[PDB]
Design a protein around this ligand. Sequence first.
Ligand code: NA
Ligand code: NA
Lengths: 115, 115, 99, 99
Amino acid sequence: NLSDVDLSKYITTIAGVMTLSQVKGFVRKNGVNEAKIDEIKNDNVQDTAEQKVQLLRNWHQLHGKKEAYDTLIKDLKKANLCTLAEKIQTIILKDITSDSENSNFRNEIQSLVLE
Amino acid sequence: NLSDVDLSKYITTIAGVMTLSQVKGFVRKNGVNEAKIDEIKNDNVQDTAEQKVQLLRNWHQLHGKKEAYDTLIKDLKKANLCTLAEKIQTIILKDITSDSENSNFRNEIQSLVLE
Amino acid sequence: GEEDLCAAFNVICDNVGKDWRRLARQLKVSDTKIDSIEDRYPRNLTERVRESLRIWKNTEKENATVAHLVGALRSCQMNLVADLVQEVQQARDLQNRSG
Amino acid sequence: GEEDLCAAFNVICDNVGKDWRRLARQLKVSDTKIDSIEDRYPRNLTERVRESLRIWKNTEKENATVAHLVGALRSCQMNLVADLVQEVQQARDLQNRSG
Ligand code: NA
Ligand code: NA
């Protein structure tokens, strides 16, 4: 009855934490051929959010849990690690080249890893 | 009566968070000529800890508070930022290249910034 | 906070399933409540999981943290789900700044 | 913890001076105690500042944090001292791992 609503809420949550290109990249690596992508891309020309959800939906219904988990977790892990690296580098270069105090550095880092 | 003990406790604290080359670099930039450094260097051949303290002592008794502060704070800020950059880079490259989970990342970052 | 716990809940709901009562127990959800959740939502396993979490959030207004959700999951050997919740939370932390 | 607060105290003691009573007040040190600190140590201004801090540490066994020392300092516009205390603490954080 609510199987598909809960699946939708879940896949929407993953969609919201990935960019369209990032989703396209991931699903391409894990069994969604450029055929299916284009079909999805032309069904939602205005709606890029729905594009990500359909792409992930198509990917999701192709895989054993252990594979779907490992693959997605790995993907998010690397994306996270790159963004952390970019954001922390920016803070550091900003503060290392400033003449004022940066009593905000600790707070800044802590917010990037809030849990 | 205790002016010099408290000045010693303070300068020892700063000395403990700097390397001998870092202290030598700092005081050189802020008015302690290579003369005074060598005189200090040969008075404590065995004791590198005391070298740092004498070096800082000599520097300390040469400067208005506003200048002593700004220069020392700036120096510690840059050294801290460099060491953070190195340490965080290592965690990120270690994790980004691992196949296992690294549930430790947040804790790792948090420790670096503990206050 | 609010939206973070929602994100976590959506991940957990659609991925826990069989051993949800084990998870409810770790969230210090009483058996008196777990019996009633079995009664309220006999149809969907996913709906039972959600209400268990909702009770937990109402049980600590200020201390209902994702960090503690992840502890709960890991203590019931639901590690892959914990991993995914962590990575989504971390992803979300990195958007607040950019987005 | 222990050694961290020492390091902070050593920095504060030798750099506060004139407006120490202002700082004592921010650390919620009673006037009844500040009067007696003026009596006990009339000679050295640095010794008066130290005892002020010692009372504050004894006033919160578990909650006497360097973070709150830095708040105290900043609320008295002793920002350069606060800065120094923060940087020393940060330096110390980065040695625990290496050293
Ligand atoms: Na991560
Ligand atoms: Na970096």
